[PDB]
Design a protein around this ligand. Structure first.
Ligand SMILES: [Mg+2]
Ligand SMILES: [Mg+2]
Ligand SMILES: [Mg+2]
Ligand SMILES: [Mg+2]
Ligand SMILES: [Mg+2]
Ligand SMILES: [Mg+2]
Ligand SMILES: [Mg+2]
Ligand SMILES: [Mg+2]
Ligand SMILES: [Mg+2]
Ligand SMILES: [Mg+2]
Ligand SMILES: [Mg+2]
Ligand SMILES: [Mg+2]
Ligand SMILES: [Mg+2]
Ligand SMILES: [Mg+2]
Ligand SMILES: [Mg+2]
Ligand SMILES: [Mg+2]
Lengths: 117, 87, 67, 96, 32
RNA sequence: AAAAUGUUUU
RNA sequence: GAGAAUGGAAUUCCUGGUGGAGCGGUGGAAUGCGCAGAUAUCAGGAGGAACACCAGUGGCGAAGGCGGUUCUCUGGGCCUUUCCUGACGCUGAGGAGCGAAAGCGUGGGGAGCGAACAGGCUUAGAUACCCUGGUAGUCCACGCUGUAAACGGUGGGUACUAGGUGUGGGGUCCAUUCCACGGGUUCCGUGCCGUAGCUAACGCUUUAAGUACCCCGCCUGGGGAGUACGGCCGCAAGGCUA
């Protein structure tokens, strides 16, 4: 529809799945994907291959929306971060300053209780 | 206790001009410190550690007064009469 | 160990003086550990307090983030 | 009569003259009661390491003043109640 | 310590506290 | 990943 | 240690933009949330709580304990050659105070967390573990309670009895400086190794669990039982004595 050219990427990879959001540098999201959106569901949507699929799908849809090289910010203690980075590279668009936008409390709020598995 | 009234107390309770550590001087200094800390505690009733310091000062002054009274009872009476009459 | 990290001297700390505080702040924006900064305990404490004051007073970033 | 160092971050929209007027009036309220003012340094306009009240820059002032604790507290409350100063800090270097 | 001693005392205390909880009302009606 | 128990011989 | 102001990140909620099918969660799931636009993403705002890095092999406190910054108020410790007093010391039954957390009372606050609780899973059952929710509480003010594996499971004081080696604090000395790097030395901490010695052994060993002296608390087989009766304390829970 509209050519945004520059854009940027947000790669939120948690212990449960991976979410990729291609957005206008104004912050408005242009396209998005996740392991749940591209097929996988449940435990098997935490795999790096699921992040691969979701990242390439989001990149492709941003491409037919007309979006060139990306500045990427990654966040979360997931496993699909790098793999999604490669996926964006493979679909093909220049990747810039991989960030570390993941948050970190200064103690702050109390974390939930330790699991007793 | 900016050392000004401390030196004043030392000189006006000293037994002789060079005296700076006799029980009379010590009791006078301790009493002034107890008064100041009592005012501080009245402002901050929750300062338990400072209150313990105050109790330590009270006990130290009590032992010094006990020594003074054991040696010279009339001197003890004069000292406490100057210093709050021991109420 | 830590003796090979020679003890470093700084003189006055002076939280206003950003040069030393930059020398002791990490590339990410954090305060460097003692075993890597090579400071005495007292100098390290003064440097940490000065870094915190400069952070609160806008002379230093709380975190430099992207390099 | 202790000595203090107040660092003041003034809104960047100030362009001279009125910054000096504010400094003069605050130094006046310091000096009304035996409070000597050792030094006033205006660093000028500097970029803030992070945004303060939506402002990317600020005017930096350093006031070295010898005065009483009550006077310095009253100066601090004036600077707080003022709406034209972004931030204030009152250091008391124990040695100098 | 073999922890067995602490476990024995633990069970005795817990049983007595359960007795107090179940007989709380009667004690305050007539007794301690 | 959870996954209990083991009367009385002489 | 107490008081007051105040800083930034993060969580949650709110408002708006963007965008669209899931999100979340687990061993695997589901409950749950979501086209009434969630998750995500950006901007703005509100609010409560805790203070990354510094930060441990460390510091302080009688103990319990103590970590954003600044100011105000305040306690104790350490060192020093001179100075002062001249045994004023030590310990301390009863007594008094302080005393984590949970708990209680009145009022406030409430983001996150989270007993109870509800639901989903697992299971022979699951009044559990795990998951989604979630109230007291956690927070503040003023009281109350007075108990902990409140432990170094080691009462306080003092003198003496190989060393070796880290580290925290104050001096002082030296050479080059006329800083400091360095070495020494001294006083006070705080660890590790280790001799004599001690111990049933494990281990302790100048920070004693060694050799001694002073004072206090306490023990006398395991259960019954720190329970009953009585008394005291408390609003209650209960605590103390036993
Ligand atoms: Mg308070
Ligand atoms: Mg840490
Ligand atoms: Mg340690
Ligand atoms: Mg003499
Ligand atoms: Mg008592
Ligand atoms: Mg509590
Ligand atoms: Mg309450
Ligand atoms: Mg209430
Ligand atoms: Mg739960
Ligand atoms: Mg303890
Ligand atoms: Mg005991
Ligand atoms: Mg004792
Ligand atoms: Mg002993
Ligand atoms: Mg030692
Ligand atoms: Mg023994
Ligand atoms: Mg009882």
């Amino acid at each position: 529809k509209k050519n945004v050219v520059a854009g940027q990427a947000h790669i939120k990879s948690t212990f449960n799945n991976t979410i990729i959001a291609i957005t206008d540098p104004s912050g408005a999201v242009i396209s998005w994907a996740s392991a749940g959106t591209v097929g996988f569901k449940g435990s098997r949507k935490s795999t790096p291959f699921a992040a691969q699929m979701a990242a390439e799908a989001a990149g492709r849809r941003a491409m037919e929306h007309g979006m060139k090289r990306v500045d990427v910010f990654v966040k979360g203690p997931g496993s699909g971060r790098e793999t999604a980075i490669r996926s964006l590279g493979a679909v093909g668009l220049e990747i810039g300053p991989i960030s570390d936008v993941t948050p970190v409390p200064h103690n702050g709020c109390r974390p939930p209780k330790r699991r007793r598995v | 206790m900016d050392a000004a009234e401390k030196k004043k107390i030392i000189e006006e309770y000293a037994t002789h001009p060079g005296d700076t550590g006799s029980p009379d001087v010590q009791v006078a200094i301790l009493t002034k410190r107890i008064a100041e800390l009592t005012e501080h505690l009245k402002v901050h009733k929750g300062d338990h550690h400072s209150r313990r310091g105050l109790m330590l000062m009270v006990g130290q002054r009590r032992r010094l007064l006990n020594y003074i009274a054991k040696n010279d009872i009339e001197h003890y009476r004069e000292l406490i009469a100057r210093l709050g009459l021991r109420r | 160990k830590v003796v090979p990290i020679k003890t470093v001297h700084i003189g006055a700390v002076d939280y206003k003086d950003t040069a030393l505080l930059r020398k002791f702040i990490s590339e990410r924006g954090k305060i460097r550990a003692r075993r890597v900064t090579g400071l005495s305990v007292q100098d390290q404490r003064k440097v940490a307090i000065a870094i915190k004051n400069a952070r609160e007073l806008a002379l230093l970033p709380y975190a430099s983030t992207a390099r | 009569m202790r000595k203090y160092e107040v660092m003041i971050i003034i809104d960047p929209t100030v362009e001279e003259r009125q910054v000096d007027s504010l400094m003069e009036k605050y130094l006046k309220v310091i000096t009304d009661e035996k409070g000597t003012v050792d030094n006033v340094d205006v660093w000028g306009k500097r970029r803030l390491a992070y945004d303060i009240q939506k402002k990317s820059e600020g005017i930096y002032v350093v006031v070295n003043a010898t005065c009483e604790p009550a006077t310095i507290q009253e100066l601090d409350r004036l600077l707080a109640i003022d709406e034209k100063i972004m931030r204030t800090k009152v250091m008391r270097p124990e040695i100098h | 310590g073999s922890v067995i001693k602490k476990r024995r005392k633990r069970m005795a205390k817990k049983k007595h506290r359960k007795l107090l909880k179940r007989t709380r009302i009667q004690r305050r009606r007539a007794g301690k």
